[PDB]
Amino acid sequence: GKKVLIVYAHQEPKSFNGSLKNVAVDELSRQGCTVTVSDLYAMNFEPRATDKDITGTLSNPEVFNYGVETHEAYKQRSLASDITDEQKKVREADLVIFQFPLYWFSVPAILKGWMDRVLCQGFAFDIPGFYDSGLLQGKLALLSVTTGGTAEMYTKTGVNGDSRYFLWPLQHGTLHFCGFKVLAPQISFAPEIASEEERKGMVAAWSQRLQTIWKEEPIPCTAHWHFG
Amino acid sequence: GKKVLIVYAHQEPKSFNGSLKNVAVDELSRQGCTVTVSDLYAMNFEPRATDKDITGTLSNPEVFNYGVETHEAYKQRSLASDITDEQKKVREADLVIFQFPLYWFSVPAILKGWMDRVLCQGFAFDIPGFYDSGLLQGKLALLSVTTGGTAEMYTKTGVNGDSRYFLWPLQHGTLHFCGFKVLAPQISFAPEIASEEERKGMVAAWSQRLQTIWKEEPIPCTAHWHFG
Ligand SMILES: Cc1cc2nc3c(=O)[nH]c(=O)nc-3n(C[C@H](O)[C@H](O)[C@H](O)COP(=O)(O)OP(=O)(O)OC[C@H]3O[C@@H](n4cnc5c(N)ncnc54)[C@H](O)[C@@H]3O)c2cc1C
Ligand SMILES: Cc1cc2nc3c(=O)[nH]c(=O)nc-3n(C[C@H](O)[C@H](O)[C@H](O)COP(=O)(O)OP(=O)(O)OC[C@H]3O[C@@H](n4cnc5c(N)ncnc54)[C@H](O)[C@@H]3O)c2cc1C
Ligand SMILES: COc1ccc2[nH]cc(CCNC(C)=O)c2c1
Ligand SMILES: COc1ccc2[nH]cc(CCNC(C)=O)c2c1
Ligand SMILES: [Zn+2]
Ligand SMILES: [Zn+2]
């Protein structure tokens, strides 16, 4: 019996993003999976990487190096509880779904801050200890992204480039780096411009894909997949 | 005369980023330029895109849509003042320099939230009015980035892929989108690994480049430049 974490980054429960999150919960629930949702905005999740992320006393109180300090806090069980709460959710999950609108060819800052502060060295990766040596191997990850731009725009010769090109930092630089196998992204192009019925189709595509998510092989998370 | 804004995203004044920011201020100062720095961590800059960013009557109080509400608020002058404060700095600047450490093949969340909240519709772009018709046309922008990974790792055949691939969402999807011309990036690779003379070299290389910044031409911020 499979365990899923949804990390959800939208301000509005009635949004397209909210509905994608809610049918994921509905469908994965119906299947009998264990489901957990991190509703970042509702949590007022802190995005900033600061010295407040370490409790007690610093490994080097004179010069603050966030990566060093968080690595030695993880090893010594002195990370801030908001971090470690999320790390627990990840540790337990077989699959991590990220549900977000595209902000500047990336994730909204609040979700960027989740990646920055939750995926610390010792938990997600070490230096050295990354990519296939990353610490979240055996887990699946999946980006479920909504865009303002059309599919059209997201082509190699289109104004925005191929959508793969913006996935690189997220899928490869982040999710692969950490050991994840990367399920094929779910991209919901341009719902604010789509008709009701097209929107319904995209939600149902997502509901249906979700019926057979566990039968999926990861994408090959390569430069060639993304650029060639 | 020329006017520079440095948007700086590092927690530690004694860091390698801190040194790069200060040599920029020193050199650009020496040349007679007008220089302004937004030290985001020191400002406790808010990264989250929330309904707190609009103080006036919302256009749809039942269903919150951050893009629609911020676009309206900018036109009516009911955005949060922290946003407006940054927009004034950008509007005055001839050149915007971003100084940051690479976090997950991207900017630190606090700086992502600057992008998200400061570059709103009406101020930075319109629909229509983006890419070469973006509202910040006539301005220059430059990413000054530091990394953990070495240069070799950031090559087409190295584990990270070429350095330009991770620049795409920044340079193209954000800066060119808003009309900026983009000067070639300054990438200071792996300062932590480097020797102290090589670190000094990197600082001084940046200072030296800034001597002739105003004579540079922008890159052609296309898919071909980034991906080949
Ligand atoms: C800071 C910022 C940066 C941005 N940067 C980019 C960028 O780089 N690239 C880009 O392409 N876009 C960008 N965008 C736009 C953003 O990606 C899209 O606006 C977002 O993806 C749309 O998703 P949403 O959930 O808010 O849509 P919504 O507007 O909330 O939903 C679209 C419509 O679907 C309806 N809907 C909701 N649930 C259902 C349902 N169950 N069935 C049918 N219809 C339903 C809603 O009611 C609504 O009418 C940016 C936006 C912001 C604010
Ligand atoms: C959340 C997170 C995610 C990351 N993701 C990535 C990623 O995707 N890819 C990647 O490659 N890296 C990544 N890193 C690594 C990060 O990019 C590097 O740690 C960072 O760029 C190093 O810069 P710094 O200023 O912090 O270095 P510092 O550690 O501050 O500097 C290195 C040394 O230079 C010294 N120094 C300072 N000023 C000078 C001077 N004037 N002359 C000589 N020496 C000087 C310092 O004192 C120090 O000893 C990540 C780190 C974190 C925390
Ligand atoms: C994809 O390369 C990455 C990804 C995440 C990372 N975090 C950290 C490093 C290197 C140095 N360590 C710190 C300071 O965190 C790093 C490299
Ligand atoms: C880099 O693309 C971006 C960046 C910021 C943005 N904010 C809102 C949108 C949607 C714009 N809608 C269309 C179809 O043009 C948007 C796109
Ligand atoms: Zn990969
Ligand atoms: Zn471009």
Side-chain angles (χ1 to χ4, degrees):
Chain A
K2 292 289 184 201
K3 309 176 154 187
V4 188
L5 169 68
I6 305 170
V7 182
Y8 166 69
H10 206 283
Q11 310 90 343
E12 183 48 64
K14 295 176 181 145
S15 65
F16 195 77
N17 271 269
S19 303
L20 293 167
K21 180 262 289 171
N22 288 335
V23 309
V25 170
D26 288 352
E27 173 56 26
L28 292 166
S29 285
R30 187 197 63 73
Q31 294 172 22
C33 304
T34 297
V35 184
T36 309
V37 177
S38 289
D39 183 339
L40 301 187
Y41 292 98
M43 292 166 74
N44 207 47
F45 190 78
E46 170 64 68
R48 307 174 190 90
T50 79
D51 62 4
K52 300 186 199 279
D53 292 352
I54 297 89
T55 59
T57 63
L58 301 178
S59 177
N60 177 349
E62 312 308 310
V63 174
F64 185 66
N65 179 317
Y66 187 79
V68 170
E69 298 272 353
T70 63
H71 183 199
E72 298 291 325
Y74 176 80
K75 287 192 296 196
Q76 294 306 309
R77 299 149 313 274
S78 315
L79 294 163
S81 59
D82 66 331
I83 296 170
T84 57
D85 291 348
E86 296 307 300
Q87 291 187 335
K88 186 177 173 173
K89 304 164 192 182
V90 177
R91 181 177 297 113
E92 297 173 0
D94 293 299
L95 170 61
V96 182
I97 300 173
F98 297 84
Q99 179 64 60
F100 60 95
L102 199 69
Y103 279 14
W104 294 122
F105 280 30
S106 184
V107 292
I110 197 168
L111 175 50
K112 189 52 161 60
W114 188 99
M115 293 158 170
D116 298 345
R117 292 173 73 239
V118 176
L119 305 173
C120 77
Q121 194 180 340
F123 174 70
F125 72 91
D126 264 307
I127 303 291
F130 44 92
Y131 285 119
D132 293 335
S133 296
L135 312 176
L136 312 178
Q137 51 185 292
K139 302 195 191 288
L140 299 160
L142 193 166
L143 305 171
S144 178
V145 192
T146 76
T147 72
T150 68
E152 243 103 71
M153 315 198 200
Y154 291 102
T155 56
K156 312 243 204 172
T157 57
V159 297
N160 294 338
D162 196 58
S163 51
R164 290 194 195 181
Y165 298 161
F166 76 68
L167 296 168
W168 175 249
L170 299 176
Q171 295 198 153
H172 182 78
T174 311
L175 295 177
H176 194 171
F177 190 86
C178 296
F180 295 100
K181 303 308 189 169
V182 178
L183 303 182
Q186 190 74 16
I187 306 171
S188 306
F189 287 103
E192 286 152 296
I193 267 171
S195 58
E196 282 277 82
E197 294 317 301
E198 287 164 337
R199 288 202 298 250
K200 299 313 184 44
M202 288 191 297
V203 176
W206 180 226
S207 199
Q208 321 203 24
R209 169 173 183 192
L210 287 169
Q211 296 176 203
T212 66
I213 203 77
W214 310 102
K215 286 324 213 297
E216 283 188 19
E217 324 156 21
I219 62 159
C221 192
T222 69
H224 179 238
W225 187 89
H226 293 86
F227 305 107
Chain B
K2 294 298 190 181
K3 303 197 167 334
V4 180
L5 172 65
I6 307 170
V7 185
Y8 168 70
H10 204 287
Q11 309 92 347
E12 178 41 70
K14 302 176 196 157
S15 62
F16 192 75
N17 273 264
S19 298
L20 290 172
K21 179 266 287 176
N22 290 326
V23 308
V25 171
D26 293 340
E27 171 54 30
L28 297 162
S29 191
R30 184 201 65 76
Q31 286 173 31
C33 301
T34 299
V35 182
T36 306
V37 179
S38 284
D39 180 341
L40 303 182
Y41 288 101
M43 296 166 68
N44 287 334
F45 192 76
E46 170 63 61
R48 305 171 195 87
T50 78
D51 66 16
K52 301 306 185 54
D53 288 350
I54 301 95
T55 67
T57 311
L58 299 162
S59 100
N60 186 333
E62 325 303 18
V63 183
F64 183 68
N65 177 313
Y66 185 81
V68 165
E69 298 292 354
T70 55
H71 181 200
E72 184 63 6
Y74 170 77
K75 290 186 289 187
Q76 292 298 343
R77 315 188 177 125
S78 50
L79 283 167
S81 68
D82 61 333
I83 293 171
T84 284
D85 289 348
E86 295 308 293
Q87 291 179 339
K88 182 175 178 186
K89 298 164 199 186
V90 175
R91 180 182 292 111
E92 291 184 346
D94 299 296
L95 166 68
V96 187
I97 298 169
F98 300 89
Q99 178 63 60
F100 59 100
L102 197 68
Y103 276 21
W104 295 119
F105 276 36
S106 185
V107 289
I110 198 172
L111 175 51
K112 185 53 159 55
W114 189 101
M115 294 309 188
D116 300 340
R117 296 174 68 243
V118 175
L119 302 176
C120 72
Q121 193 176 341
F123 171 66
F125 70 93
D126 230 307
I127 308 294
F130 57 83
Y131 288 123
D132 291 349
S133 302
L135 304 177
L136 306 178
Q137 61 184 269
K139 300 187 187 298
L140 300 164
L142 182 168
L143 305 174
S144 181
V145 185
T146 65
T147 69
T150 64
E152 148 83 59
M153 289 179 250
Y154 286 107
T155 55
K156 192 177 155 108
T157 65
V159 293
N160 296 338
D162 190 56
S163 52
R164 296 185 178 189
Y165 299 167
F166 75 64
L167 306 167
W168 175 248
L170 307 169
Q171 296 185 151
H172 184 74
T174 305
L175 300 169
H176 186 183
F177 186 90
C178 297
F180 289 96
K181 299 265 198 203
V182 178
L183 298 178
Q186 190 70 13
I187 314 190
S188 305
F189 290 103
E192 291 164 291
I193 280 172
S195 59
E196 195 194 345
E197 287 97 46
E198 291 170 305
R199 287 201 286 272
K200 289 231 127 59
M202 286 192 291
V203 175
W206 175 226
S207 194
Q208 170 106 328
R209 175 172 178 199
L210 284 169
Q211 296 176 27
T212 57
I213 201 77
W214 302 108
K215 298 171 102 268
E216 296 184 15
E217 303 292 337
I219 70 170
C221 186
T222 64
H224 178 266
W225 185 92
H226 290 84
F227 313 113

